[PDB]
């Protein structure tokens, strides 16, 4: 597509307006539109894409969890299939949104990404969207988990080789990969180890950052530490 007749620059402009208006579904459709124009995305453009879909999927995941626990509490009076039906409805929409993002990545963001920064970005996105599928998978599950692991690992290899330890996407990648280990892959020890090594390596590289870079890196470093406080 419905965005096929709007100018690329117009879609981007409207995505920024949808962001300011907190209209993330709109924002997500504009950015999908923008991607399907077939030109590679700038740094700013990637951020808008990611913000849009994370907000849409964040609302869905939160609804799922509410409903999924109402459902588990009902298997411990017979109420009917309504809870399950609605939980499946929400689940199905969630899966459609992950499938949309994973389709954009496969057609053709990942293969056209030649620079480390863009390539890491997209492989991290791939990891995160398989991780969200994995959170709801029951049947399938093992394949989805391996697809997540595989994307995250590839991104980690590139980021280790090509980016300084304080790079915010490197830190955010590692934070998300360690949440994968802990919550999805049943590997607390791997989660803790990764979070610790990532924090320590960033700490020892801070002296190279300007004041602005310093602010950015330390914000996500704090989230690694918050997690470590919970896990240890």
């Amino acid at each position: 597509g419905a965005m096929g007749s709007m100018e690329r620059a117009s879609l981007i402009q409207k995505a920024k307006l949808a962001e300011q208006a907190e209209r993330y579904e709109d924002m997500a459709a504009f950015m999908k539109g923008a991607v399907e124009k077939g030109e590679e995305l700038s740094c700013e453009e990637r951020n808008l894409l990611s913000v849009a879909y994370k907000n849409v999927v964040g609302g869905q995941r939160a609804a799922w969890r509410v409903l999924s626990s109402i459902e588990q509490k009902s298997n411990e009076e017979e109420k009917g299939p309504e809870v399950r039906e609605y939980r499946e409805k929400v689940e199905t929409e969630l899966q459609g949104v992950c499938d949309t993002v994973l389709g954009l990545l496969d057609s053709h963001l990942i293969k056209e990404a030649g620079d480390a920064e863009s390539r890491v970005f997209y492989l991290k996105m791939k990891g995160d969207y398989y991780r969200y599928l994995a959170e709801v998978a029951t049947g399938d599950k093992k394949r989805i988990i391996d697809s997540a692991r595989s994307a995250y690992q590839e991104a980690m290899d590139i980021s280790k080789k090509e980016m300084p330890p304080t790079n915010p996407i490197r830190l955010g990648l590692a934070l998300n990969f360690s949440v994968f280990h802990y919550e999805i892959a049943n590997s607390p020890e791997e989660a803790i180890s990764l979070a610790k090594t990532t924090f320590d390596e960033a700490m020892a590289d801070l002296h190279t950052l300007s004041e602005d870079s310093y602010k950015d890196s330390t914000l996500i470093m704090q989230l690694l530490r918050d997690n470590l406080t919970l896990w240890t």
């Binding site: 913000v51 998300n176 949440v179 802990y182 919550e183 989660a191 996500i220 918050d226 919970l230």
Partner: peptide, 9 residues
Amino acid sequence: RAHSCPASL
């Protein structure tokens, strides 16, 4: 529970 990377972007 653990926090993943938010918004920030």
